[PDB]
Design an enzyme around this catalytic site. Structure first.
Site, PDB file in Angstrom:
ATOM      1  N   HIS A  92       1.840  -0.102  11.859  1.00 26.27           N
ATOM      2  CA  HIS A  92       2.798  -1.196  11.528  1.00 26.27           C
ATOM      3  C   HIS A  92       4.167  -1.036  12.217  1.00 26.27           C
ATOM      4  CE1 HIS A  92       3.975   1.366   7.878  1.00 26.27           C
ATOM      5  NE2 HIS A  92       5.167   0.897   8.252  1.00 26.27           N
TER       6      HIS A  92
ATOM      7  N   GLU B 201      -4.457   2.977  10.415  1.00 20.55           N
ATOM      8  CA  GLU B 201      -2.955   2.945  10.308  1.00 20.55           C
ATOM      9  C   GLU B 201      -2.275   4.036  11.143  1.00 20.55           C
ATOM     10  OE1 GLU B 201      -1.674   0.252   9.439  1.00 20.55           O
ATOM     11  OE2 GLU B 201       0.482   0.841   9.496  1.00 20.55           O
TER      12      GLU B 201
ATOM     13  N   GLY C 211      11.750   3.435   4.329  1.00 24.45           N
ATOM     14  CA  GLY C 211      12.403   4.455   5.175  1.00 24.45           C
ATOM     15  C   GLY C 211      11.663   5.788   5.209  1.00 24.45           C
TER      16      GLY C 211
ATOM     17  N   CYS D 107       8.353   5.929   6.078  1.00 25.98           N
ATOM     18  CA  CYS D 107       7.130   5.735   6.906  1.00 25.98           C
ATOM     19  C   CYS D 107       7.211   6.612   8.155  1.00 25.98           C
ATOM     20  CB  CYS D 107       6.782   4.284   7.214  1.00 25.98           C
ATOM     21  SG  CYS D 107       6.297   3.348   5.730  1.00 25.98           S
TER      22      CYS D 107
END
Ligand SMILES: O=C(O)c1ccsc1
Length: 181
Positions: A41, A72, A146, A148
């Site tokens: 992402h 992911e 914040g 990730c």
């Protein structure tokens, strides 16, 4: 404070950079040579900022399992003049559950941050921001925007990168040795 935090600090001080895309600032784990990982992402493009320096992306691959399901993890090869310390020998070979894990974040917003998250479950399937995702790890810590790309470790293993949370639980994508052979 103890041997969990000691291992976490060694990984952070040698094997992390701050990555910036059009989607935000992320902790980025360097794995070996010029190869690093970031959450998918982050939408890595042709150019990324590494510690505030314009960097060409030589290659980028959004990993999916053999069922064509999101994992992911994006693997990125950076046009950088220096290699990472090789930490492939700290990656697990199989999917697993873990005790006594640490989540470590380093960004402009959260510098030198370490969180004892405790027990980590092999959770498996997660609908992450609407996207079916596999090989998710879960810990019962109320993680915030914040975090990730934050690195999940146990003493002696680098097990995942933080990819989201629901306000009570946090979720990481597994790292496996086979992604980086
Ligand atoms: O270079 C290292 O091995 C290191 C850095 C901080 S703690 C360990």
């Amino acid at each position: 404070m103890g041997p969990g935090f000691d291992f976490a600090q060694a990984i952070m001080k040698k094997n992390t950079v701050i990555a910036r895309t059009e989607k935000g600032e992320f902790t980025m784990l360097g794995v070996y040579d010029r190869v690093a990982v970031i959450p998918t992402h982050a939408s890595v493009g042709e150019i990324i900022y590494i510690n505030d320096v314009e960097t060409r992306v030589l290659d980028a691959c959004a990993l999916r399992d053999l069922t064509d399901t999101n994992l992911e993890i994006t693997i990125v090869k950076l046009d950088r003049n220096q290699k990472f310390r090789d930490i492939r020998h700290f990656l697990p070979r199989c999917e697993d559950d873990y005790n006594d894990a640490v989540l470590s974040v380093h960004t402009s917003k959260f510098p030198n941050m370490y969180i004892p998250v405790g027990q980590v479950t092999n959770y498996g399937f997660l609908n992450l921001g609407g996207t079916p995702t596999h090989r998710i790890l879960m810990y019962n810590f109320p993680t915030r925007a914040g975090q990730c790309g934050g690195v999940v470790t146990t003493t002696g293993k680098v097990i995942g990168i933080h990819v989201g949370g629901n306000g009570a639980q946090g979720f990481a994508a597994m790292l496996l040795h086979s992604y980086f052979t």
